[PDB]
Amino acid sequence: MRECISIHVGQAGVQIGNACWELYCLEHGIQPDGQMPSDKTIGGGDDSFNTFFSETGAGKHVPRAVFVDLEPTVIDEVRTGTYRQLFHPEQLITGKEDAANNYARGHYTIGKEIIDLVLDRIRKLADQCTGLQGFLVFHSFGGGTGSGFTSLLMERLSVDYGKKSKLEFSIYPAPQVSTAVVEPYNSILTTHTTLEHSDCAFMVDNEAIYDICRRNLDIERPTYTNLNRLISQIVSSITASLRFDGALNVDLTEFQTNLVPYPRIHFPLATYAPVISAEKHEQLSVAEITNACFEPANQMVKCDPRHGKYMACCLLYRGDVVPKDVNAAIATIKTKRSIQFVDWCPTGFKVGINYQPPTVVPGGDLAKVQRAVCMLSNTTAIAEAWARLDHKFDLMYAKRAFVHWYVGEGMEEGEFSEAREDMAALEKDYEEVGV
Amino acid sequence: MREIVHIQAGQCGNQIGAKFWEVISDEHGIDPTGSYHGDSDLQLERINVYYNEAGNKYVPRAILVDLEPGTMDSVRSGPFGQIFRPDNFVFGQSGAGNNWAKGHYTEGAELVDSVLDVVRKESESCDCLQGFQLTHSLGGGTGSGMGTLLISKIREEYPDRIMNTFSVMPSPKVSDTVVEPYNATLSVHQLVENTDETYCIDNEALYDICFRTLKLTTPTYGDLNHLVSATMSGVTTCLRFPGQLNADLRKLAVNMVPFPRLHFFMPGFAPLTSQYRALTVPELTQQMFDSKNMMAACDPRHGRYLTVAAIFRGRMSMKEVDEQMLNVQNKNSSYFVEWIPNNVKTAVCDIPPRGLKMSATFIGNSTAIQELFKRISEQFTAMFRRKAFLHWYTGEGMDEMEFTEAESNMNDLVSEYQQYQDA
Amino acid sequence: MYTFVVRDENSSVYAEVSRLLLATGQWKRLRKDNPRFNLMLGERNRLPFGRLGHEPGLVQLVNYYRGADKLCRKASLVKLIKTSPELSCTWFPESYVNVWIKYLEKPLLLEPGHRKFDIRSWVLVDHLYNIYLYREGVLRTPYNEGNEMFFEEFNQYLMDALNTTLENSILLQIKHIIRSCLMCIEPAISTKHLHYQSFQLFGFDFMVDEELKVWLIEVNGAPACAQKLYAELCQGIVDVAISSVFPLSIFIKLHH
Amino acid sequence: VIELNKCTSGQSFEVILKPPDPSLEEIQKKLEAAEERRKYQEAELLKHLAEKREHEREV
Ligand SMILES: Nc1nc2c(ncn2[C@@H]2O[C@H](COP(=O)(O)OP(=O)(O)OP(=O)(O)O)[C@@H](O)[C@H]2O)c(=O)[nH]1
Ligand SMILES: Nc1ncnc2c1ncn2[C@@H]1O[C@H](COP(=O)(O)OP(=O)(O)CP(=O)(O)O)[C@@H](O)[C@H]1O
Ligand SMILES: Nc1nc2c(ncn2[C@@H]2O[C@H](COP(=O)(O)OP(=O)(O)O)[C@@H](O)[C@H]2O)c(=O)[nH]1
Ligand SMILES: [Ca+2]
Ligand SMILES: [Ca+2]
Ligand SMILES: [Mg+2]
Ligand SMILES: [Mg+2]
Ligand SMILES: [Mg+2]
Incomplete structure (x- = not known):
């Protein structure tokens, strides 16, 4: 067994982290107390769920997680939440002055003052790992801490844990819920500085999550709680292979080798189905949920893979699913949809089935479904998200709007341009992979 | 903070x-x-x-x-x-x-x-x-x-x-x-x-x-x-x-x-008070953007919005507020600069002010604020061109040069606003 | 009120619809790069499809179908017909990427004159992928007004010369070609579940031989129209493709 | 269906339809370069503010 340490950064990262560990606890039968009546090996053990949970001599299952935020309002809700006794105080790190939606303030000014501490707190979790695999980092693109401090942390984790993988779960900025006007700046800045330090990043567009909540769950104006519960399900689908027994995506290295042939193009598109309102329903079949994986409306990033090319595709089922029905579904979809792979890759699917149907938190808005699927496909169509973002960046930077806020924090105007040209180089790499 | x-x-x-x-x-x-x-x-x-x-x-x-x-x-x-x-x-x-x-x-x-x-x-x-x-x-x-x-x-x-x-x-x-x-x-x-x-x-x-x-x-x-x-x-x-x-x-x-020097905001409020009939959400958004509701005597249609912050107070549909706010932007997008995407940010607070069930507060960084500094500048120049009433200030040690500097510094501020209104 | 932008002043067809849209009092034209639009009359080449459908509170439509160029450019049209079991094909000349351009040896010739001709048909596909063929086609006329004969005169000719009508001898085949081509690519380009909608005007080029058999030569994604037919067609684009999604016959509906 | 593995919790397989960094001192360097620029900009402001105190006394 090999351990995984989760790092939650900023409001988005921390609040999403809460929704994930709450879900993890329900799936592994871990009560808010931290006890786990199913775990018969007290004080230790090397089961699959130990990849995310350590054990105390008193039978408490505590996460291999660290929550950091440059202001305490959000992490204080963890210290008093229903899962407060789950976490150990040294796992929750807070400042008192946040980055004010300023990448430079998060990376340079305030990040410098706290980077040393969080690494020691991470070193504490690492020291109690027999063989740490790597890190899962949850953060936003638009926040000053999520963008600015993560890139600094990702740089230091590479120099301190060189042989260890890092996966991202990144929240892509959407104006329907965005906090700031400068989120395009912070997004480009943190992508540039983190690109070489991230082995594979799962990008989630709040716009897509927002509209899925409006359409499928029929919430008039979704809140972060709505968005994070849906996001938590998707995260749980991606990480289920590390926490449960299986043979597909069993370690963080396997995510890279299965979904990322080219290192820079390490942003798989995620598609989830089905999402049904708890206030409702006919149960969908293997073919119907697999077909839904190719509807733009169910993707974490709105884009059209029909006009891109696939480098890798992975199907992760949860519930009542047998391999026979998966093949019969793939055979039907491949003849009735536009699934074109790159010439230098096989046209196929890596399938993983977990018999335990998806768990939904009581009192939530998700109807318990008997079988679900999350598809991870590395398609060049996701570059549409970079195109939208780079365009917004170009509009403001042409007039140097808001640039003074970043230069006032010790950052140089050159980092803006050098980060933009890196995205121009990321944008061209996609172009010549799905020609 | x-x-x-x-x-x-x-x-x-x-x-x-x-x-x-x-x-x-x-x-x-x-x-x-x-x-x-x-x-x-x-x-x-x-x-x-x-x-x-x-x-x-x-x-x-x-x-x-x-x-x-x-x-x-x-x-x-x-x-x-x-x-x-x-x-x-x-x-x-x-x-x-x-x-x-x-x-x-x-x-x-x-x-x-x-x-x-x-x-x-x-x-x-x-x-x-x-x-x-x-x-x-x-x-x-x-x-x-x-x-x-x-x-x-x-x-x-x-x-x-x-x-x-x-x-x-x-x-x-x-x-x-x-x-x-x-x-x-x-x-x-x-x-x-x-x-x-x-x-x-x-x-x-x-x-x-x-x-x-x-x-x-x-x-x-x-x-x-x-x-x-x-x-x-x-x-x-x-x-x-x-x-x-x-x-x-x-x-x-x-x-x-x-931009550091363009930080002068034009506030608005709706409804106007000195009252039992509450306003619809569309009525609140139409008034909070109306010239007759601004606290700076400037016509917003004479300039362009760089950034806008809108605050809604009361128990209302946050959907309907989003529709109406996204509605005003798309109907008069010419008055919002194209080079700052999504420059209108909205907030809703559940507690309304005293006496009102629904209210809307407008904070705008418009280039039309220039009209106000121009108004102050012309009144200033009308007297300063004849050095009228200056003895009150020179008697306290000030020099004429300090006045000419303030005059041109504000004219620069007006020029800065006109620069981004034509951009 | 509805809003729209224009990014192709060289389009003669859509320079007209831009005029009628402004002539109804319910459409306000914005400048080229204002993203808060309901309708884009976008550029021919490199249309930013990836930036549409991301404006909260705005239903966005564009006059081009992403992916339709696989049908319009000949090189892609050849590979589409031979690699699609839906076509494989009796009405397409032999093409590859004893007279070749396959140049059809014996075309139907208009008498008097020994004249060669090719038929241009205008087809409109709306956001719901309804296929609308404009009822008024044009004919673009030795062989060894303005070279344009409209459908009425050509019909009367075939009734007098070869004792048949245009509907029976040519137009049934034409309608079959339009349906086959356009429904071959429906799963690849349709916007029925996309975050933005698409319609597009198409210009099909057809041929007729002395056996009254119809051949597909070329399909154009940015076609022009005959002068007299500019008014009726352009106004039909407003009623069928624009007003249908933004509410304020001359088409035959190739059903399915 | 290739590489079918089964266990009690589920099973996984693969279908095929068709064959085909900066060091620590460099980081701390750029972080200290950004700090000295903050301190320099603040020094020029406090110098500018010290000049206006001189003028206040002169008036
Ligand atoms: N899905 C989701 N997005 C969130 C959540 N919280 C914030 N965001 C998004 O994150 C972006 C803002 O970044 P934040 O994480 O809130 O800011 P931060 O990381 O705390 O950085 P600073 O506050 O500037 O120090 C916006 O685009 C928000 O829409 C959340 O709980 N769920
Ligand atoms: N297989 C063929 N046999 C006979 N003539 C052919 C032909 N293919 C093309 N042509 C001739 O060429 C003319 C049309 O040219 P073509 O459609 O191939 O290219 P193009 O795009 O320049 C015409 P448009 O400007 O209308 O799109 C027809 O009038 C027809 O006379
Ligand atoms: N809105 C408002 N303006 C005032 C009030 N009192 C004075 N002013 C304005 O302030 C200016 C006079 O300055 P004042 O505050 O009286 O002088 P100070 O006490 O030396 O700062 C004039 O332009 C007045 O119109 C008030 O109660 N309300
Ligand atoms: Ca145990
Ligand atoms: Ca005194
Ligand atoms: Mg914060
Ligand atoms: Mg007074
Ligand atoms: Mg004192």
């Missing part, structure tokens, strides 16, 4: 300041004795932004300044006179005679060290100081001259804190003296250099709203301050209540100020 240090200086500054505290104290459930008496907890969750704790009594983090004792003596006996901290009454005896030079260089310099001594004690006991909030007029002497002197000293000791002002720009329609353009031009240059956020409250607009919209034959300063206090309560809602948008002063500055 949680605590804000409030400073009200001068006649206008202290009168407007007294109403501000009278209003938000009611919203947070604080009576004149400093004891809380409210039914909801949202009143107390962020009350530490503007109030210190004493017998579980809340006292404003407010500093009352003036070179005359007259106005601050009436505050001490006002409806909420006993709530302010006794020591935070810092006053002289000479007055400033509506003379910027007296407030900035002679009379005020003699008193400002005492104010800073009170500022220091208020700030050093702050867990995390956001910055400072000043209320004053730019047409007088103390609030204008000593106010900007105070801002300059505060920036020196707290260079990494936000400086936010509610300024009252003079207008011949409600004028005390003819030298108001002089004092206003000298003050604006200071504000351009040493503030991050300035809410431009134009007495011309306040008067016009009272005489035209509210149909008051003869508006008083109380009628004018009724509009100001309502605006001040609105624009600070995000600071005083839980929320994700512009919930503190530096995040507000980052969203609203694309």
Whole structure:
């Protein structure tokens, strides 16, 4: 067994982290107390769920997680939440002055003052790992801490844990819920500085999550709680292979080798189905949920893979699913949809089935479904998200709007341009992979 | 970032300041004795932004300044006179005679060290100081001259804190003296250099709203301050209540100020009050964007919006608010600059102000604010071209050169706004 | 009120619809790069499809179908017909990427004159992928007004010369070609579940031989129209493709 | 269906339809370069503010 340490950064990262560990606890039968009546090996053990949970001599299952935020309002809700006794105080790190939606303030000014501490707190979790695999980092693109401090942390984790993988779960900025006007700046800045330090990043567009909540769950104006519960399900689908027994995506290295042939193009598109309102329903079949994986409306990033090319595709089922029905579904979809792979890759699917149907938190808005699927496909169509973002960046930077806020924090105007040209180089790499 | 240090200086500054505290104290459930008496907890969750704790009594983090004792003596006996901290009454005896030079260089310099001594004690006991909030007029002497002197000293000791002002720009329609353009031009240059956020409250607009919209034959300063206090309560809602948008002063500055010197904001409020029929959401959004609802006498259609912050108070459909806000933008997108995408940010607070079930507060960084500085500049030049009334200032040691610099510095500010209106 | 932008001043067809849209009092034209539009009349080449459908509170439509160029450019049209089991094909000349251009040896010749001709048909596909063929086609006329004969005169000719009508001898085949081509690519380009909608005007080029057999030569994605037919067609684009999604016959509906 | 693995919790397989960094001192360097620029900009402001005190005394 090999351990995984989760790092939650900023409001988005921390609040999403809460929704994930709450879900993890329900799936592994871990009560808010931290006890786990199913775990018969007290004080230790090397089961699959130990990849995310350590054990105390008193039978408490505590996460291999660290929550950091440059202001305490959000992490204080963890210290008093229903899962407060789950976490150990040294796992929750807070400042008192946040980055004010300023990448430079998060990376340079305030990040410098706290980077040393969080690494020691991470070193504490690492020291109690027999063989740490790597890190899962949850953060936003638009926040000053999520963008600015993560890139600094990702740089230091590479120099301190060189042989260890890092996966991202990144929240892509959407104006329907965005906090700031400068989120395009912070997004480009943190992508540039983190690109070489991230082995594979799962990008989630709040716009897509927002509209899925409006359409499928029929919430008039979704809140972060709505968005994070849906996001938590998707995260749980991606990480289920590390926490449960299986043979597909069993370690963080396997995510890279299965979904990322080219290192820079390490942003798989995620598609989830089905999402049904708890206030409702006919149960969908293997073919119907697999077909839904190719509807733009169910993707974490709105884009059209029909006009891109696939480098890798992975199907992760949860519930009542047998391999026979998966093949019969793939055979039907491949003849009735536009699934074109790159010439230098096989046209196929890596399938993983977990018999335990998806768990939904009581009192939530998700109807318990008997079988679900999350598809991870590395398609060049996701570059549409970079195109939208780079365009917004170009509009403001042409007039140097808001640039003074970043230069006032010790950052140089050159980092803006050098980060933009890196995205121009990321944008061209996609172009010549799905020609 | 949680605590804000409030400073009200001068006649206008202290009168407007007294109403501000009278209003938000009611919203947070604080009576004149400093004891809380409210039914909801949202009143107390962020009350530490503007109030210190004493017998579980809340006292404003407010500093009352003036070179005359007259106005601050009436505050001490006002409806909420006993709530302010006794020591935070810092006053002289000479007055400033509506003379910027007296407030900035002679009379005020003699008193400002005492104010800073009170500022220091208020700030050093702050867990995390956001910055400072000043209320004053730019047409007088103390609030204008000593106010900007105070801002300059505060920036020196707290260079990494936000400086936010509610300024009252003079207008011949409600004028005390003819030298108001002089004092206003000298003050604006200071504000351009040493503030991050300035809410431009134009007495011309306040008067016009009272005489035209509210149909008051003869508006008083109380009628004018009724509009100001309502605006001040609105624009600070995000600071005083839980929320994700512009919930503190530096995040507000980052969203609203694309260029350091273009930080002069045009506030609006709807509905206009002096009332049982509540407004629809579409009616609130149409009024909060209407010229007749602005507190700066400027036509927004004569310029272009760089950034906008809209705050809705009351129990309303957040959907319907989103539709109507996304609606106004898409219908008049020509008045929003194309090079700042998504420059309109909306917030909704569940608690409405006193007497109203629904209200809307508008904060706009429009290039039409230029019209106002142009108005002050022409009044200034009309006298300065003949050096009229200058002896009042040269008698206090000022030189003509300082006036010509202030004149051209504001003309530069006007040119800066016209640059981005044609971009 | 509805809003739209224009990014192709060289389009004669859509320069007209831009005029009628402004002539109804319910459409306000924005400048090229204002993203808060309901309708884009976008550029021919490199249309930013990836930036559409991301404006909250705005239903966005564009006059081009992403992916339709696989049908319009000949090189892609050849590979589409031979690699699609839906076509494989009797009405397409032999093409590769004894007279070749396959140049059809014996075309139908208009008498008097011994004249060669080719038929241009205008087809409109709306956001719901309804296929609308404009009822008024044009004919673009030795062989070894303005070279344009409209459908009425050509019909009367075939009734007098070869004792048949245009509907029976040519138009049934034409309608079959349009349906086959356009429904071959429906799963690849349709916007029925996309975050933005698409319609597009197409210009099909057809041929007729002395056996009255119809051949597909070329399909154009940015075609022009005959002068007299500019008014009726352009106004039909407003009623069918624009007003249908933004509410304020001359088409035959090739059903399915 | 290639590489079928089964366990009690589920099973996984693969279908095929068709064959075909900066060091620590460099980081701390750029972080200290950004700090000295902050300190320099603040020094020029406090120098600018010291000039206006000189003018205040001169008036
Ligand atoms: N899905 C989701 N997005 C969130 C959540 N919280 C914030 N965001 C998004 O994150 C972006 C803002 O970044 P934040 O994480 O809130 O800011 P931060 O990381 O705390 O950085 P600073 O506050 O500037 O120090 C916006 O685009 C929000 O829409 C959340 O709980 N769920
Ligand atoms: N297989 C063929 N046999 C006979 N003539 C042919 C032909 N293919 C093309 N043509 C001739 O060429 C003309 C049309 O040219 P073509 O459609 O191939 O290219 P193009 O795009 O330049 C015409 P347009 O400007 O209308 O799109 C027809 O009038 C027809 O006379
Ligand atoms: N809105 C408002 N403006 C005022 C009030 N009192 C004075 N003013 C304005 O302030 C200017 C005079 O400055 P004042 O505050 O009286 O001088 P100071 O005490 O030396 O700062 C004039 O332009 C007045 O119109 C008031 O109560 N309300
Ligand atoms: Ca155990
Ligand atoms: Ca004296
Ligand atoms: Mg935060
Ligand atoms: Mg006075
Ligand atoms: Mg002293």
